[PDB]
Design a protein around this ligand. Structure first.
Ligand SMILES: CNC(=O)COc1cc(C(=O)O)cc(-c2ccc(C(=O)O)c(OCc3ccccc3)c2)c1
Length: 242
């Protein structure tokens, strides 16, 4: 049910890069990765944590729906797309940390820990600051654990309302055409070593879904586009996307 494919390493090496890609064929119920050890090593989730954070805020009513506007606080931050009003859709798309920090403060440590325990999310550990533990606290999750979480989400099995899960899957929409739909969430972990980039989600086909979770070493922000690029090359090699 798990199978290693060292050939994908060619795509990391081609870009002077290091990391892991994990795929899960939902229909056949089996998985593939270029590095079984790394696939199960636990990293900070960073902004991939916006998937559970969104689910929790929605189910608790911290966020009423995907249209509720979170007004820019007027602080001019380093990322231009952060210096504006957001809803849940745009906050997810632009990884607007300060919006989700407000969610986390509203959720609170007790509810947050209870929820992550209910989700079986990673090591279920929120130690650190209530509004940054997923970037520099004690929470950790592996690429394999990301897929297990993402499969519950896809099937509406997580303990939150089906409504919450449908809203978050809508907000995860990243790309779609006649050939496929990608629902995914990037992450960029820079506060604690090793600096890594993440991309987790799934590719929806006509008659199957391919879940994926990748992380890679990311010493500089200049290589952030490699998250999607290397993932897509793997997908093409496997004839999942054209
Ligand atoms: C052009 N950018 C956009 O449109 C959306 O902007 C982002 C995209 C992405 C992505 O993963 O791609 C990631 C972030 C992001 C995530 C976490 C933190 C954190 O606080 O740890 C963070 O800190 C500020 C920062 C500024 C500059 C360089 C490094 C860090 C930024 C922001």
């Amino acid at each position: 049910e798990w199978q290693e494919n060292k050939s994908w390493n060619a795509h990391f090496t081609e870009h002077k890069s290091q990391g892991v890609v994990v795929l899960w064929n939902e229909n056949k119920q089996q998985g593939f990765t270029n590095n079984l050890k790394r696939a199960n090593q636990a990293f900070l989730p960073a902004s991939t944590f916006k998937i559970p954070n969104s689910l929790i805020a929605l189910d608790l009513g911290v966020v009423k729906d995907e249209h509720q506007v979170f007004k820019w606080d007027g602080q001019t931050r380093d990322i231009a797309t952060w210096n504006r009003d957001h809803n849940l859709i745009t906050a997810m798309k632009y990884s607007v940390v300060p919006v989700y920090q407000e969610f986390a403060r509203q959720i609170g440590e007790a509810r947050m820990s209870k929820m992550l325990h209910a989700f079986d999310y990673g090591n279920e550990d929120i130690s650190g600051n209530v509004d940054s533990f997923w970037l520099d606290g004690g929470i950790r999750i592996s690429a394999t654990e990301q897929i297990s979480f993402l499969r519950k989400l896809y099937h509406n099995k997580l303990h939150v309302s089906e409504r919450s899960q449908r809203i978050v899957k809508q907000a995860m929409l990243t790309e779609a055409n006649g050939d496929y739909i990608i629902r995914a969430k990037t992450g960029y972990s820079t506060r604690i070593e090793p600096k890594i980039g993440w991309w987790v989600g799934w590719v929806e086909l006509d008659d199957n879904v391919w879940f994926f979770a990748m992380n890679m070493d990311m010493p500089t922000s200049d290589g952030l586009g490699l998250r999607q690029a290397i993932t897509k090359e793997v997908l093409k090699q496997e004839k999942i996307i054209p």
